[PDB]
Amino acid sequence: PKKVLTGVVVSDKMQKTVTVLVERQFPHPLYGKVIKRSKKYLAHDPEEKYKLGDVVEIIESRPISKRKRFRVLRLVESGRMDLVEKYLIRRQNYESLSK
Amino acid sequence: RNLSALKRHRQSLKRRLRNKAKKSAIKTLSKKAIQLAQEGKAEEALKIMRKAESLIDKAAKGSTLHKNAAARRKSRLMRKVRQLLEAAGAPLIGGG
Amino acid sequence: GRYIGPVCRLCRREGVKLYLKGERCYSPKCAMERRPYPPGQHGQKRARRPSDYAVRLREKQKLRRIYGISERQFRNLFEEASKKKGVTGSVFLGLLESRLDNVVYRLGFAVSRRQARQLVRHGHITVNGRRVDLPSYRVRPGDEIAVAEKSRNLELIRQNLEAMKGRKVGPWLSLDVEGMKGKFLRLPDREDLALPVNEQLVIEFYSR
Amino acid sequence: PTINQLVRKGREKVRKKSKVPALKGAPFRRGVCTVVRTVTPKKPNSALRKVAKVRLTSGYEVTAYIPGEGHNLQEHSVVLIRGGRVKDLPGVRYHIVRGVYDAAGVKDRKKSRSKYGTKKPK
Amino acid sequence: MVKIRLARFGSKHNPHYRIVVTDARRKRDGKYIEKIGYYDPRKTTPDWLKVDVERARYWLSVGAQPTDTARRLLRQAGVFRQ
Amino acid sequence: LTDPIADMLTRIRNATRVYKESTDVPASRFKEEILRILAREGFIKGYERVDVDGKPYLRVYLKYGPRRQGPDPRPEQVIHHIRRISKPGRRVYVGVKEIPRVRRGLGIAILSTSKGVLTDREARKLGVGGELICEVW
RNA sequence: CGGGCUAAUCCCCCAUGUGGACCCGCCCCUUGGGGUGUGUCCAAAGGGCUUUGCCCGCUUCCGGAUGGGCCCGCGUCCCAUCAGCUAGUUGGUGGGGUAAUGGCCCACCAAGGCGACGACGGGUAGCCGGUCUGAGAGGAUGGCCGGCCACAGGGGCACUGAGACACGGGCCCCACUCCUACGGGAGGCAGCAGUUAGGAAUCUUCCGCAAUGGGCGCAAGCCUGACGGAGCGACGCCGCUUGGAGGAAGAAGCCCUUCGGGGUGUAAACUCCUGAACCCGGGACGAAACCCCCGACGAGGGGACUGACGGUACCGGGGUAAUAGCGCCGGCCAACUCCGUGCCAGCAGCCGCGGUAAUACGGAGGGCGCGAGCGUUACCCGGAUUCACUGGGCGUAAAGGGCGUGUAGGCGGCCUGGGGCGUCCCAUGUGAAAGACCACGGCUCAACCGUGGGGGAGCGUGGGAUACGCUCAGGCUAGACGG
RNA sequence: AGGGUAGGGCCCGUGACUGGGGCGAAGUCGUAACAAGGUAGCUGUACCGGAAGGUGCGGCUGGAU
Numbered sequence A: 001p002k003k004v005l006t007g008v009v010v011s012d013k014m015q016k017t018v019t020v021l022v023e024r025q026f027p028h029p030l031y032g033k034v035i036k037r038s039k040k041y042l043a044h045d046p047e048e049k050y051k052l053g054d055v056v057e058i059i060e061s062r063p064i065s066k067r068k069r070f071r072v073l074r075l076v077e078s079g080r081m082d083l084v085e086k087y088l089i090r091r092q093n094y095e096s097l098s099k
Numbered sequence B: 001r002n003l004s005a006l007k008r009h010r011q012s013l014k015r016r017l018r019n020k021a022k023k024s025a026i027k028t029l030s031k032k033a034i035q036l037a038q039e040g041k042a043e044e045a046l047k048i049m050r051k052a053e054s055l056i057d058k059a060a061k062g063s064t065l066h067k068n069a070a071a072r073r074k075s076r077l078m079r080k081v082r083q084l085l086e087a088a089g090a091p092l093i094g095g096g
Numbered sequence C: 001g002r003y004i005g006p007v008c009r010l011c012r013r014e015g016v017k018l019y020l021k022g023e024r025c026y027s028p029k030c031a032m033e034r035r036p037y038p039p040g041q042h043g044q045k046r047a048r049r050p051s052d053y054a055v056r057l058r059e060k061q062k063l064r065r066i067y068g069i070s071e072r073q074f075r076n077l078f079e080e081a082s083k084k085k086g087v088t089g090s091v092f093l094g095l096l097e098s099r100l101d102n103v104v105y106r107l108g109f110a111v112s113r114r115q116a117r118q119l120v121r122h123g124h125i126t127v128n129g130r131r132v133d134l135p136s137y138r139v140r141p142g143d144e145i146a147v148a149e150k151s152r153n154l155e156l157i158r159q160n161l162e163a164m165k166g167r168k169v170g171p172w173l174s175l176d177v178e179g180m181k182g183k184f185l186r187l188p189d190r191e192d193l194a195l196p197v198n199e200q201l202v203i204e205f206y207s208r
Numbered sequence D: 001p002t003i004n005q006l007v008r009k010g011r012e013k014v015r016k017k018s019k020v021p022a023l024k025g026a027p028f029r030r031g032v033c034t035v036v037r038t039v040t041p042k043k044p045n046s047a048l049r050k051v052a053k054v055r056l057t058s059g060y061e062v063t064a065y066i067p068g069e070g071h072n073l074q075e076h077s078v079v080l081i082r083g084g085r086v087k088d089l090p091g092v093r094y095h096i097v098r099g100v101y102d103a104a105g106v107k108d109r110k111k112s113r114s115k116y117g118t119k120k121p122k
Numbered sequence E: 001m002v003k004i005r006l007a008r009f010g011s012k013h014n015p016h017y018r019i020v021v022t023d024a025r026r027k028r029d030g031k032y033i034e035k036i037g038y039y040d041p042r043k044t045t046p047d048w049l050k051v052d053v054e055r056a057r058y059w060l061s062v063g064a065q066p067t068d069t070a071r072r073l074l075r076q077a078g079v080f081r082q
Numbered sequence F: 001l002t003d004p005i006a007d008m009l010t011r012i013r014n015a016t017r018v019y020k021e022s023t024d025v026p027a028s029r030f031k032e033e034i035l036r037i038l039a040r041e042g043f044i045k046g047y048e049r050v051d052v053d054g055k056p057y058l059r060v061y062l063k064y065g066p067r068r069q070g071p072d073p074r075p076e077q078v079i080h081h082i083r084r085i086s087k088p089g090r091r092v093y094v095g096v097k098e099i100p101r102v103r104r105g106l107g108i109a110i111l112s113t114s115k116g117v118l119t120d121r122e123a124r125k126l127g128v129g130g131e132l133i134c135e136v137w
Numbered sequence G: 001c002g003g004g005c006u007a008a009u010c011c012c013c014c015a016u017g018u019g020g021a022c023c024c025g026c027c028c029c030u031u032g033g034g035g036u037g038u039g040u041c042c043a044a045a046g047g048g049c050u051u052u053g054c055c056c057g058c059u060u061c062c063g064g065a066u067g068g069g070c071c072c073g074c075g076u077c078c079c080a081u082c083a084g085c086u087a088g089u090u091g092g093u094g095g096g097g098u099a100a101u102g103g104c105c106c107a108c109c110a111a112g113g114c115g116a117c118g119a120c121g122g123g124u125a126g127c128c129g130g131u132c133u134g135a136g137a138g139g140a141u142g143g144c145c146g147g148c149c150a151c152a153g154g155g156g157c158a159c160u161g162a163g164a165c166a167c168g169g170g171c172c173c174c175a176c177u178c179c180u181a182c183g184g185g186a187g188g189c190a191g192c193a194g195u196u197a198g199g200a201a202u203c204u205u206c207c208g209c210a211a212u213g214g215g216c217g218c219a220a221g222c223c224u225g226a227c228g229g230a231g232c233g234a235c236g237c238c239g240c241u242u243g244g245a246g247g248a249a250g251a252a253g254c255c256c257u258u259c260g261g262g263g264u265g266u267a268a269a270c271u272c273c274u275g276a277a278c279c280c281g282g283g284a285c286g287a288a289a290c291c292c293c294c295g296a297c298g299a300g301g302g303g304a305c306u307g308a309c310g311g312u313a314c315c316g317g318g319g320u321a322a323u324a325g326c327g328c329c330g331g332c333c334a335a336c337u338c339c340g341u342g343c344c345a346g347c348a349g350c351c352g353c354g355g356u357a358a359u360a361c362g363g364a365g366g367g368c369g370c371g372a373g374c375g376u377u378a379c380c381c382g383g384a385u386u387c388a389c390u391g392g393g394c395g396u397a398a399a400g401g402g403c404g405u406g407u408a409g410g411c412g413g414c415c416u417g418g419g420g421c422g423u424c425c426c427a428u429g430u431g432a433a434a435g436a437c438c439a440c441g442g443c444u445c446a447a448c449c450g451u452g453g454g455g456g457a458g459c460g461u462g463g464g465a466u467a468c469g470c471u472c473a474g475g476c477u478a479g480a481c482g483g
Numbered sequence H: 001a002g003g004g005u006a007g008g009g010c011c012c013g014u015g016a017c018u019g020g021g022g023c024g025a026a027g028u029c030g031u032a033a034c035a036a037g038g039u040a041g042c043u044g045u046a047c048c049g050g051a052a053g054g055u056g057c058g059g060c061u062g063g064a065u
């Protein structure tokens, strides 16, 4: 089947495409502990409808372009900007991890 | 030193010869009407377009082209004509 | 191959009687009967505390030398039995006794497995009719062991045969005498042979 | 430490430092002597041990201690070596192999001959 | 085409061919799609040949074709019983 | 506080060593559900829902072994041992097949499950598993 | 090179269109899926026998079947003493192109994409099944066999084609070598052997298509360094022999002695018995099909030819006592004395042996262990609980950051409800075979190989339960903050 | 493809000379630490000195009585 992912949108800057950040959990193969891992996918937004903060469900679609293989299956929620913060704050923090 | 491959190899160039020609003629005619499409000349354009179809298809008969391809070159051919002939029109012959 | 060297030295060094030939081992001409002390220049010296290792080393060789089997051939079976179900001891034991040569001697066909092998290795023996010059054949229950009809005319067999007619054979053994055709009934338990062995000690040995 | 840390930094699978580099992961490398002589050891011993300095197809050049008594080793003598150092002799890490190449075993040697390349008498 | 034939197993002088279905473009003993019989040619057992005469007809229906001897093996399997 | 469970357990293990007739713990249906197991197996004497200066609790009534001679007459422990397993640092999860058997069958391991807290044996009986709460003997 | 001729299953046009291709419209569907209608386009090939019929082929269209291409999710080594990378770079519109999505290619608009969840760079390495070690978790490993990938002297390219950008095809460039009649041409073992070089070291320039499998052919048959075997190599595993029984209070020699003796030693000698090899006779399984006969070229039933290994194994008769070598003996670690020597000549894996009474070197006697093997070196796991998930630790033994503040992150108190992410249960598809594991069966055993049986983790699909974790919502006040 | 011009990045090897370091030892100078080691020792820095080291400022006791 076509894999469905429940990720957040972090970028609307591109035209007709969004950056759906997808987060997943799992145990450690050695230390049992549950361990969070994320991964951004590039969702197709033909109607430029989806917006910043939109939690969405993405489906593995046939290749639209390079790197873009999941369309947006459907909306879930809105106003979810707290997550963005937990994203951008990261990207912003990196500015101090150089030399 | 020598092998039937020498026999095998040669034939190609001959076959090589025959395919490249058809394609060249195709695109030669395939586009030729397209120009007319820009200035149709609807009757005369559709007269060319039909010809390319035959050569195109008739290539699909042999190793020259694959059916889906010919259809593509076919499909992409037709599409262009009307669209061009849209601005102006109107088709005199077929088709269609 | 197998040992095949001076043998009395075995019994001596061990401190026990191993009837490795046949008659003499009963005769008063035996070593242990005469010199039951270690062979070599230092036999009659006061032995000293053998090590826990050295101990476990004994029981082995003792048993191992009893059948005259290469150390290897004596790993396999005990890797056999150890990876074999239940009490590895009994099995391996039954795995050992299940050798042709042995049983052949266990069937009183020859004073020593040494003989047993040779007669065995010389194919003078048969099983289920079949001839077997295989002194390592693992005989199973339900096997018919018959002396070679071609060698039924030998006199040595009969001299050992004769001295067997009604002799007491193992519970897991028969001996349709005359017909020179014994038979192997079952696999024994430790209590079936009271060998001068503590098999577990050999268990402890390879446990290294 | 925390399981987290073990997740973040894990644990370090410390590897091994080979003790015979001049071999290049090989059991035997041919060489050619360069400085046949004697070498005194560090305490608590005293003597004049039989060393051999050898250049190798591995390009290197290392002292190789000549085992036994009496040999036939001088400059340009084709030789083979083996892994094995000589505790008391710093600067020596490998052994030479008698009865091989321009090296001959020990004379009138009867025991452990294998380790000293010396065939069998009568 | 996909064919049906014997893949030699066992050891030197120890034939034991698996009557199996695979692509001819496979090597003799390589990856097959489905085993459907087994064959001791030298006749060392009272059951040196078997066939899934059912499935064996399955493939043959779908066009697969056997090597001659495999066809024999399937012969005495009765697969061709009209 | 991080894990009340181990704390609960800890509180116990801390008194059993000093030989307390009872001891107290902040309350929670889960802590109780646990304790429910810990007398039906017999490590405790049972609990009652007490209440301290306005706050709920669970004064657990402790069970110990008999007085002894020798020089150390102190009564052997019922709960010889009680340690947490699955934790917030490392949540531990088991399938029914991979459910351990404490100390060859003399102890138990409390398990949280979709079918209520169970013992190492009760689960295997009910054919399930879950977050191994702790092992105790 | 050129001039001119000839056939066809070669190539070209026209006709016939079941059917299929494209456009545009419409039903259904839902990404370019199927059906429908008008205009347009297109098929082809003959040959052979016993001759108004057969077999082989040729054409299109649907489907099956297998083999594929592209795309996704999770997983896949070392260094942060690499901390920033990016312009085809990420997205879009529109075209090219392919069998097909695509920035795979071009044009233009936008300014965006990746990264401490380790981007970018460097070093290394072909991955998986498995293999070895291991109580296990784990580690090391990826030859052989099986699957996939990538390369065919070092690079690029497209043609032929169902299919490649092709190892023994082609075009060019480079490096190299050789031939030559000196004008010029050729070649590509990482296919089977073989040579040369490098190295510690890895084999025969052998037989044959009898089998299995493959291409071509209706068949006969052909090709077949795939495959089946032979040889070389103790390279590893398995099996076997150098003999068996009798045999003195015990030859000689040899070692020790307290000089009475002790040890080698049942060892030999010799008696009997058995009979490895080597001689002769016999001599296979593998080989039943294609094909031919009747029938119907079919089901089915009859008929022959064929064996590389090979006159080999194996069967029979007869028949000779017929190789033993290596390591070790201070403790670890089983096995003791004597001479020589005198911190010299020497052993050594660690602690350490020797300086005139060495169980530690050498030799010998004797002894210990394996046994056509025995030892060493190298490398991997083990012991190493010494990178510690199972399963360690930081007052003085190595290890608390000089101290705070605070981002990310990890973690989070009592009670109720919804969702059902982790988590648990059942069903189910995949999880190839080989191997591992149990049972048994064939080579006289075993090693080897065959047959059947018996599981899982992991992830895909459907259902269920709700204790703890999480999420959404409502309360509380025992942590915190505050008056 | 590649060849050529030019300029950067990184890594290996090599180099007159040079700086310390390790091991060997049976030499030379002195005797800093281990006892109140004969000036309690160690420590950070700073300066000085043939050398261990001395000393100044502050710190710890892992300082004897």
Ligand code: SF4
Binding pocket: C007, C008, C009, C011, C012, C017, C018, C019, C020, C021, C022, C024, C025, C026, C029, C030, C031, C032
């Ligand atoms: S039984 Fe007696 S004669 Fe036989 S080997 Fe043993 S000690 Fe020697």
Ligand SMILES: [Mg+2]
Binding pocket: B028
């Ligand atoms: Mg033109």
Ligand SMILES: [Mg+2]
Binding pocket: B059, B060, B061, B062, B063, B064, B065, B066, B067
């Ligand atoms: Mg075509």
Ligand SMILES: [Mg+2]
Binding pocket: C081, C082, C083, C084, C085, C086, C087, C088
């Ligand atoms: Mg067992």
Ligand SMILES: [Mg+2]
Binding pocket: C206, C207, C208
């Ligand atoms: Mg073991």
Ligand SMILES: [Mg+2]
Binding pocket: D044, D045, D046, G343
């Ligand atoms: Mg000394």
Ligand SMILES: [Mg+2]
Binding pocket: D032, D056, D057
């Ligand atoms: Mg050289």
Ligand SMILES: [Mg+2]
Binding pocket: D076, D077, D102
């Ligand atoms: Mg010389």
Ligand SMILES: [Mg+2]
Binding pocket: D083, D084, D085
């Ligand atoms: Mg070594």
Ligand SMILES: [Mg+2]
Binding pocket: D111, D112, D113, D114, G327
């Ligand atoms: Mg030796």
Ligand SMILES: [Mg+2]
Binding pocket: F085, F092
């Ligand atoms: Mg745990």
Ligand SMILES: [Mg+2]
Binding pocket: none
């Ligand atoms: Mg003509």
Ligand SMILES: [Mg+2]
Binding pocket: G042
């Ligand atoms: Mg036409």
Ligand SMILES: [Mg+2]
Binding pocket: none
């Ligand atoms: Mg293609």
Ligand SMILES: [Mg+2]
Binding pocket: G088, G103
């Ligand atoms: Mg690009």
Ligand SMILES: [Mg+2]
Binding pocket: none
């Ligand atoms: Mg711009």
